Design a protein around this ligand. Structure first.
Ligand SMILES: [Mg+2]
Lengths: 45, 173, 237, 133, 60
RNA sequence: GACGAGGCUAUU
RNA sequence: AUCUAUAAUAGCCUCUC
């Protein structure tokens, strides 16, 4: 399906990855250290 | 045999056969009469009530729900930035980027209408900055000439840009 | 008019409000009041999102000064409003999928992980209870909604998920906003109901106008004359 | 399988008047228009990035669950699964010349059913709806 | 058309091609056609529809 | 160096 | 009773002397 949105691709990808990381953390898919790394990278971006 | 004049926008020679003299022989003639065309269209409208209105309304709705990416659906398209032929998507991307260079961000809104407004406005800019392709030539002995293309910024005037926008690229079938 | 909004509401709030009105295709200048409302709404959301943080035991705790950034890992609440429709819908659907709750039929304003529920925060000018019930008319229980009012009236949903300090802070912020806009003479600027019909705009520039003018058949000076002729004349015979 | 479990009758030679009608090409157990099918497929395969829950999908909600049951642990690329689901749900209707057999089971064999001057009796396998009968 | 033929008369079919179809058709006539068709449309859409014939009248 | 439109087909 | 509805790419056919 053709994606829709007037926002930038970078912002969409950043938000999607943030949500994925948080949901993996809450579901146990990701541990503490990987979550800290992911959040640090997202914030730096 | 029509009205010949000079365009004040591009400086080109213009020929207008419409409403010209009626033909006196059986040779091909482009001197269509506006009155007769309007009479034929009114007859069509009378024989099909509401056809013109329904067609216009449907076309307007489709246009209002049409995005800028509808223009990528073509084949080789004339690209004015390189004055060449490039795939429709490539030409559209190059036009969008060049417009971004000239404070023309309608394509961001997503719809075809804002992008067409941007095209109309571009026709009015006193100057145009864009990205074009320049080739460097190297001498490879065999001697043969090797071409290395690259992107470089470029600037053209209002009349040159208008003529490029109105240009058609011709080829053989 | 807009100077008050720029000075009070931060840059991010105004940017997100403008993005929202662009999403709904509402011009800022023609409808300034709506803009302001959006901002305040967004503002309250952030406030209610910046008063708890989940810990290693999955329980909420308040924030205070002297805390490092590392300690703030995952917020207690997730913010839905102030985001592009596609992004907000993706967030809401992901939360619904990963919490085994059916997606509500309308976009929410906040998500609370502790209770795992979607919250629709509203701001009302009239009676708080009437607004609460009118919102109830849509879903009722699928999205627990809390309403605030400019007259220090609140209608919290059945499952309270906030403390008295936060509610008092939000009400005090709203009171300060009311006082400043009153002493700056802008309440009348917003109360006005001025929303005329708005439609698509396609305006021809000078070059295209001249091209169309010199693009008419023979016997016409400009395109306006040609259009009038096409519209008014009867070509019968 | 429909081809294999089929019986062939006689072949007759004679005039066959054919009319061009818009007919279904392939049988489908459940058929919906392309937009509904696309929404259902997005629900089945990409529930996260599906957007507004259009009410038109309500009738098919149960079906969605069933599909999500079969594809829970599949390693096939999602786009191939999406076009599989389209192949199963979206109908293809084309204008074709037909003479007395317009059901999709017969349109599948149309090329062998008849020409302009001959008829081939054909009994497709499977099951036929009561409405067709 | 066969069934509509008046009785006792003649019906005659002309197989025809137009010569110089693209050469002789004028974009100005197309502009007039577009203006006539969109008679009861909003002004913005009428201008939008008129753009293309205008650009073709000034083509290079 | 190989365009526009219509129909049909295959593929993702 | 198929009217509706219909993402993208590519192919073939049809449509100046
Ligand atoms: Mg012919």
């Amino acid at each position: 399906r053709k994606p829709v949105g007037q926002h930038s691709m970078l912002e969409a990808m950043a938000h999607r990855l943030r949500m994925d990381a948080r949901l993996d953390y809450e579901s146990g898919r990701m541990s503490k250290d990987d979550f800290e790394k992911a959040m640090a990278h997202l914030g730096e971006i | 045999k029509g009205k010949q004049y000079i365009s004040d926008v591009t400086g080109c020679t213009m020929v207008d056969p419409t409403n010209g003299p009626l033909p006196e022989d059986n040779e091909p003639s482009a001197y269509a009469q506006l009155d007769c065309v309007l009479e034929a269209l009114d007859r069509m409208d009378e024989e099909h009530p509401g056809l013109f209105q329904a067609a216009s309304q449907n076309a307007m709705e489709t246009l209002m729900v049409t995005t800028v990416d509808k223009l990528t659906q073509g084949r080789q398209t004339f690209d004015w930035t390189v004055c060449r032929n490039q795939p429709a998507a490539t030409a559209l991307n190059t036009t969008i980027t060049s417009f971004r260079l000239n404070d023309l961000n309608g394509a961001d809104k997503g719809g075809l209408i804002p992008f067409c407004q941007d095209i109309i406005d571009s026709l009015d800019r006193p100057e145009m900055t864009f990205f074009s392709v320049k080739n460097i030539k190297k001498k490879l002995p065999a001697f043969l000439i090797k071409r290395i293309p690259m992107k470089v910024k470029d600037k053209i005037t209002k009349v040159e840009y208008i003529k490029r926008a109105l240009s058609l690229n011709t080829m053989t079938k | 008019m807009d100077t008050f909004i720029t000075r009070n509401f931060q840059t991010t709030i105004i940017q997100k409000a403008k993005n929202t009105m662009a999403e709904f295709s509402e011009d800022p200048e023609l409808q300034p009041a709506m803009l302001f409302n959006i901002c305040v709404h967004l503002e309250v959301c952030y406030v209610i999102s910046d008063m708890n943080f989940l810990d290693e035991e999955g329980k909420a705790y308040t924030a205070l000064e002297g805390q490092g950034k590392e300690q703030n890992l995952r917020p207690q609440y997730e913010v839905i409003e102030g985001m592009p429709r596609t992004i907000a819908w993706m967030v809401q659907r992901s939360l619904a999928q990963e919490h085994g709750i059916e997606t509500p039929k309308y976009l929410a304003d906040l998500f609370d992980y502790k209770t795992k529920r979607f919250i629709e925060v509203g701001i009302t000018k009239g009676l708080a209870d009437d607004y609460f019930w009118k919102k109830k008319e849509k879903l009722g229980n699928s999205m627990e909604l809390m309403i605030f009012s400019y007259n220090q009236d609140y209608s919290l949903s059945n499952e309270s998920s906030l403390d008295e300090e936060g509610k008092g802070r939000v009400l005090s912020r709203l009171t300060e906003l009311q006082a400043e806009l009153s002493l700056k003479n802008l309440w009348q600027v917003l109360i006005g109901e001025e929303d005329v019909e708005k439609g698509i705009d396609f305006k021809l520039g000078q070059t295209i106008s001249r091209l169309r003018d010199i693009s008419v058949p023979a016997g016409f000076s400009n395109f306006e004359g040609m259009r009038s002729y096409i519209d008014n004349i009867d070509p019968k015979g | 399988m429909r081809l294999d479990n089929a019986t062939w009758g006689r072949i007759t030679f004679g005039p066959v008047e054919r009319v061009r009608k818009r007919v279904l090409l392939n049988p489908l157990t459940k058929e919906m228009p392309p937009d509904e099918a696309s929404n259902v497929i997005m629900e089945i395969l990409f529930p996260k990035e599906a957007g507004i829950p259009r009410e038109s999908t309500w009738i098919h909600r149960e079906l969605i669950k069933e599909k999500r049951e079969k594809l829970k642990g599949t390693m096939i690329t999602p786009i191939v699964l999406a076009y599989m689901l389209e192949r199963e749900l979206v109908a293809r209707r084309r204008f074709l010349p037909v003479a007395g057999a317009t059901s999709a089971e017969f349109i599948e064999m149309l090329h062998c059913l008849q020409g302009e001057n001959w008829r081939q009796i054909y009994h497709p396998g499977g099951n036929k709806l009561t409405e067709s009968r | 058309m066969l069934s509509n033929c008046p009785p006792g008369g003649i019906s005659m079919t002309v197989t025809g091609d137009n010569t110089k179809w693209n050469e002789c058709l004028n974009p100005r006539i197309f502009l007039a056609m577009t203006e006539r068709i969109t008679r009861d449309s909003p002004i913005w859409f009428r201008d939008f529809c008129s753009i293309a014939p205008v650009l073709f009248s000034n083509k290079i």
